[PDB]
Design a protein around this ligand. Structure first.
Ligand SMILES: Nc1ncnc2c1ncn2[C@@H]1O[C@H](COP(=O)(O)OP(=O)(O)NP(=O)(O)O)[C@@H](O)[C@H]1O
Ligand SMILES: Nc1ncnc2c1ncn2[C@@H]1O[C@H](COP(=O)(O)OP(=O)(O)NP(=O)(O)O)[C@@H](O)[C@H]1O
Ligand SMILES: Nc1ncnc2c1ncn2[C@@H]1O[C@H](COP(=O)(O)OP(=O)(O)NP(=O)(O)O)[C@@H](O)[C@H]1O
Ligand SMILES: Nc1ncnc2c1ncn2[C@@H]1O[C@H](COP(=O)(O)OP(=O)(O)NP(=O)(O)O)[C@@H](O)[C@H]1O
Ligand SMILES: Nc1ncnc2c1ncn2[C@@H]1O[C@H](COP(=O)(O)OP(=O)(O)NP(=O)(O)O)[C@@H](O)[C@H]1O
Ligand SMILES: Nc1ncnc2c1ncn2[C@@H]1O[C@H](COP(=O)(O)OP(=O)(O)NP(=O)(O)O)[C@@H](O)[C@H]1O
Ligand SMILES: [Mn+2]
Ligand SMILES: [Mn+2]
Ligand SMILES: [Mn+2]
Ligand SMILES: [Mn+2]
Ligand SMILES: [Mn+2]
Ligand SMILES: [Mn+2]
Lengths: 300, 300, 300, 300, 300, 300
């Protein structure tokens, strides 16, 4: 029994020592590798991630069907990074970025570096150069599916080529790199976090579709326990409904009381119906930050 | 004749003495090697296995087409093991575990160890370390097909490498290890049990598909006679329909009487139609356990 | 910090040195590759393009739904080129050119070279021949979608074939080539500029539809920052409402004052309502040119 | 400059040498491939065609809405051909030919070959047989839209099948073949001339509708510059108002003087109002022929 | 020239050999396929048909507006067939046959087979059965427009189904089948003769409307040159005015002399006014038959 | 010949075997399907029907202009049915039944079931329920034209819906159902008998209009040869003049002698003028029944 607990602890310890923390863990453990993170713009996803956001210096993959919200998510990551003064780059092979929508999400477009490479190889080489510079914090690649190999222009093999080198340089510079993928597997193994995202419904303000009910699953997580999920809405032209997540997480954590349709904080009603309570948190950011901080301290 | 019976018995005896019990047997013999087992969650499969479940300290392979039920089966093995206080590990290369579904099947997610290895070699080494610890009872690997060799990332040979060492350490610690495989052959020879599983139909509650008609064949069995089969349903979001198997096995064994569509036990009707009779056993677990125990004593 | 600025500058510099200027840039940078351009006939689009027009010696793609204005746009490019004495060619697979409308837009039909090829391959070969001649400045192909491969007559592969060779010869002769496409991806990668155009409304002179509200997005731009947009009207039988764009851009740039509905320049009213102010600029081209020149100097 | 003119000429020359004259041309050039033609019965259309009529040995397509005048046009082509002793065939899938109207247009019905095929394939095979005979000058098919494939009776693919073979044999025998089409694209590419025809108004002799104002556009022309247009009237029961076209073309070419409503030739009035002047030319065919010849020499 | 005549003859010959006589012909040729025919009751129509009547063993379609005379025509075909001892069938989906009117036209109602099918499919199957019996000479279907498909009761596709089989069996048994259609196209292609019939005026005996001026056009004719026309009257309660046609055809053929309003044959007046001359032929059938025979010999 | 008679007989036999007797027949044949019938109250109509009345278990349609006698006819059918002890139902959507007039015609109003449904669907469902009961012999629906679909209240489609089911249940219970229709076609195909009725004149007893001269045509008859007609009078407040029909039919059949205006039976005068002879038959019902029976035996 006890000696078995010690045997287990030693074994887990030796494994971790050889392959690194995160090479094995209990799915219910609170522990999370100590790493610099960048918020995803979604409170429930930062929590599902265990570390409070995406890890710096690591490779991350985000995949899902068309219109699932992959780009919105990455744009919110960029805005969050830029909010902290970090330098971001956008490697584009999709040719679909909407700067108007991006600014609405907080992205500083004027200072966003951008590249629209001729081939998959060129994209990967530009990524490595930015990684080795030690002067770029976040690199988003949209998308992997559009990274046509030079020969095919004039695939799976291309990715295995410079993936090992790219990972090494990203790690050394502490550069976060996100690959967006639309629904071979060199990315599957080199990524420290893989997110599965999809639209699971519509948000209706009466009878008009105004947003999407979204769900993200952390299918791979080398910094904290994997398989947790996040659910949130993406409002058209506005992005992730962060405050709506704050309303639910506040209640769940017993920081915000819910009596039927009326929500209240510290005794005073903040709104009838999830919609009004959300509007209230949004207009009172100072109190929202406190509640958010409280939730993070409780779940992270 | 008689001297021929004695000659046969001696020959079989010498063979067994040299290569172990299970190296040869009559397909119709009742005898089953005395071994600790872990239920598969399926009554007809535990019976098809001859020992009442999967053998501890041995390697087991479970293969079948996509959506055949391989994972559900392994998750039920884990839940059954955890129900007895055993420590389980999940080595994942598929990145598809659904903890919500897992808890529904009885899995204690919080205490399930999990690893998402970088390479096939790393997975195998983690397996060996957990085996040598003498502190892990069940290890599930999902899946073999996803165990990409390091070189291929930056196959058949990889498996033959540490398979002999892994088997030795598993045996010594009495650790059960299950390899899930999706449809070279080092696994084929080192495994003590190999299960072929597939979907042979759909379960309809009227006209809506609610489950899968499933069939498992024990193509290899070194603990008891091989080639027996098991048939059972896997209900969406619920797992193996254990009680439905109990209804049929109870009847077959003349413990439960069937008169047309009405089933009865000890004189009293328990339901009209296999569905209601199943519901009854499920709501009266204490009586179900007795009938289950009876069936096991009769067929094991 | 500073050393990080220098590290960034060096990295961007090395990238540019290896893959050419335009291989990476800040979306808010003023810099634009020094290149010969040809006006598109639209002031806001020439500005959105960053270089003041489409680049000579490069491949350009213009795509959009039916009736979005693709042809009108290309015809205005041709007229602008011919206004400077440049030799233009029209490779037609649509068989829909209206010379009456074309002359209205300024096109010199009599001197416009035209080809109506039998197959996609023949079209591409004619394009290459005109490119290699060093005697053709602008080549418009209408459209890509109508370039049926010979075999299919008696696709994606056809385009990848001679696209690399065509691009080389166009570059060497400094010949601008525009592919019109109606809504595989060899064009997507070889093009230096890709324009997304569509009708976003109707222009009504009371209650009669007289034009189309149009929007063009520069989804790909290898000569200056991509993703900018242009909005302008296309009047039936007249083409792009250049003067209407001049009214708005003049105001925006504080060159033309707007007080309610009355517009004025240098103190004197030029018209009440965007329509009259536009008419005034149109009848006073000499002053319009000055204002246009001013806007270009300010935004280019 | 000059060397650029020579470079252009050589390039155009090489293109023409490789793909044939007509593979590229200036829209304003006077040159027209030297080919045998058959008048369409319309003076402005024979001119719009550049060669003075439709080309022998080539495929021609004539399409337009219902009642646009497609059949009348083809019937006038047949009459013109028969006037020169040429053998004509009519492949019919519409079953609507009016011999009374046809004779009025000059068609020699008794000697017109006719076929009413069972399937699209049979029609095409009959066409090929007539082509290979070297004894048929003009073949009219009415219509393409009615050429139902055998299978569909007991489409796009059917046309691509024998279109290449038919074209070859027609060319070799110098047989003109016209496909009438009512508003896949194998015809679009194999045709040397494609005509778009439609009714753009009504002809009123007071308040009674007596004819149709018609417009034909040469959307494809491989024998001379494409995109020219023709406008003429089609009088009920009479066909194309040839003399009315002669009045306008004579004036335009300054062969016939117009002073208000009075027209005159060589000093003498021929009628007040376009209607009377037309009647005069019609009653004085010998002078009309001279004026017609003059116009052709001036515009062809 | 001559060799061209021989080339033409050979080509036409080969075509006829491959697709049958009637697959191509000169519209003015006297030749008519040698076939058994059944008079339509109209002398000018039997002549317009070229063979003297409708062809046995073939499918015929007769269409026209309501009250155009379609039924009267078919009833006269039946009477003519029955006059020769032929067995006739009437497949009815209109439910409007007037036996009193039918007997007046010569129809032997008592021996006319009749069917009033439940569905379009049933009608077609009954037709095939009667065809395959080799014991039915004429089948009239009234009408196609009323042949509602079974599914639609509890269309174009239905007709294409058994049309090929029906045609085969009709041909083999030499059974004439007529489809009446009121104003997809499987009938259009399988029919050997298609007749377009309509009312073009009224017959007045003073000021009272007593009949209809009728015109039939043979829009499709695979047994002789198509496109000929027939004009005759249909008197209320009497049917086709055969004798009135005989008066005109006799005159036209110079067998009957007309001097103003007086008609005469072989020197003797037979009546003043087309009406009396008709009455005379009708009361002197023996002489009428001779004149009729003469006309047929001259025009057939 | 003979073998052709046998071929015909076999073919007709096979047709009848496949689609039922009545699927084909000679219009002059005496044969009538053996079926239970209900007199229509009109002797000439029962004869025109071939079976002596309307068929039980089948659907019948009776249509005609307003005031043609449709209701009177159905009321006489009901009275005749009730005279034999049959249970009748009246489904009313017209709301115009006159019980006083009905009793005069022999209808037993007190025992007549009646329904005045809210919607067309409800009417049809009530009909089906009465049909499936096996306890209702005759159902009259007045009228189809008034069967407004539910949706239209808060048509052609409605009828096709339950017409097939209704027909099946009516047949199984041997229930006669009559649809009255006032002048889509699901009724047209499901009905076994369709009657066209209209007023063709007035009955004057001097100069006062006392009745209507009526004519019914059996346009559809699946139990015996169709297209026969019936003529009889409908006297105001009395119904069908049955005896007047008996006078004419008796004479026609040479059972009653007519010498000018005097009628006589078996030698003795029964009245001068059709009116008196009718009165005589009416006052001597016992002799009238014999004559009626005689006529039926002769014509049925
Ligand atoms: N320019 C925009 N303006 C307004 N709302 C936008 C815009 N772009 C995206 N959205 C919103 O973003 C939600 C998420 O879409 P998006 O993030 O672009 O999905 P995606 O999976 O990243 N893209 P793709 O691979 O092309 O389907 C949508 O359904 C829109 O409501
Ligand atoms: N998250 C889930 N929620 C509900 N039902 C599930 C879930 N996962 C699996 N099932 C059920 O499990 C049945 C068995 O599927 P599964 O056990 O995952 O097959 P598999 O062969 O193990 N997997 P794979 O190799 O990926 O096809 C399915 O058809 C589902 O009804
Ligand atoms: N011949 C013409 N005469 C007058 N106005 C024209 C003519 N051709 C085009 N236009 C105008 O051009 C606007 C732009 O149409 P167009 O430029 O032809 O779109 P497109 O996308 O290029 N063509 P397509 O692919 O065929 O739909 C129209 O809506 C018309 O108002
Ligand atoms: N039989 C005829 N008699 C008198 N005028 C005719 C006749 N046929 C055609 N026309 C005239 O021809 C003009 C041109 O019609 P037509 O040439 O038949 O057009 P279409 O496009 O060829 N036919 P379709 O495809 O059937 O609409 C008409 O509007 C008529 O004035
Ligand atoms: N029962 C009848 N009695 C007297 N004349 C009749 C009768 N039926 C038809 N006719 C005459 O037939 C001429 C031709 O009519 P008809 O032959 O029935 O045309 P239809 O096109 O066949 N029928 P439909 O489709 O119903 O319009 C009419 O105008 C009548 O003069
Ligand atoms: N209440 C009544 N009293 C006396 N005579 C009646 C009565 N109802 C009907 N009749 C007679 O019935 C003859 C036949 O009329 P009717 O049977 O009601 O025609 P209908 O076509 O059934 N009805 P509708 O659709 O309303 O016109 C009439 O002209 C009347 O002489
Ligand atoms: Mn995206
Ligand atoms: Mn699985
Ligand atoms: Mn266009
Ligand atoms: Mn036509
Ligand atoms: Mn008819
Ligand atoms: Mn009524």
């Amino acid at each position: 029994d006890e000696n078995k607990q010690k045997a287990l602890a030693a074994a887990l310890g030796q494994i971790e020592k050889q392959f690194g923390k995160g090479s094995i863990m209990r799915l219910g453990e609170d522990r999370s590798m100590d790493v610099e993170t960048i918020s995803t713009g979604s409170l429930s996803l930062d929590i599902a991630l265990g570390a409070g956001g995406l890890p710096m210096g690591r490779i991350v993959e985000i995949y899902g069907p068309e219109s699932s919200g992959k780009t919105t998510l990455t744009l919110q990551v960029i805005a969050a990074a830029q909010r902290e003064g970090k330098t971001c780059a956008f490697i584009d092979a999709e040719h679909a970025l909407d700067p108007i929508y991006a600014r609405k999400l907080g992205v500083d477009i004027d200072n966003l570096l951008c590249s629209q490479p001729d081939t998959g190889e060129q994209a990967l080489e530009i990524c490595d150069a930015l990684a080795r510079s030690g002067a770029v914090d976040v690199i988003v690649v949209d998308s992997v599916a559009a990274l046509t190999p030079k020969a095919e222009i004039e695939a799976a093999r291309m990715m295995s080529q410079a993936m090992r080198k790219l990972a090494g340089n990203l790690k050394q510079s502490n550069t976060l790199l996100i690959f967006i993928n639309q629904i071979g597997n060199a990315l599957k193994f080199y990524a420290s976090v893989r997110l599965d995202i999809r639209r699971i419904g519509a948000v209706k303000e009466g009878e008009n579709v105004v947003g999407s009910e979204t769900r993200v699953k952390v299918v791979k997580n080398k910094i904290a326990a994997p398989f947790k999920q996040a659910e949130f809405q993406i409002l058209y032209g506005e992005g992730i409904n962060f405050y709506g997540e704050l309303v639910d997480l506040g209640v769940k954590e017993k920081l915000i009381e819910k009596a039927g349709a009326w929500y209240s904080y510290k005794g005073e009603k903040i709104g009838q119906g999830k919609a009004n309570a959300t509007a209230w948190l949004k207009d009172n950011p100072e109190t929202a930050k406190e509640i958010e901080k409280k939730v993070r301290e409780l779940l992270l």
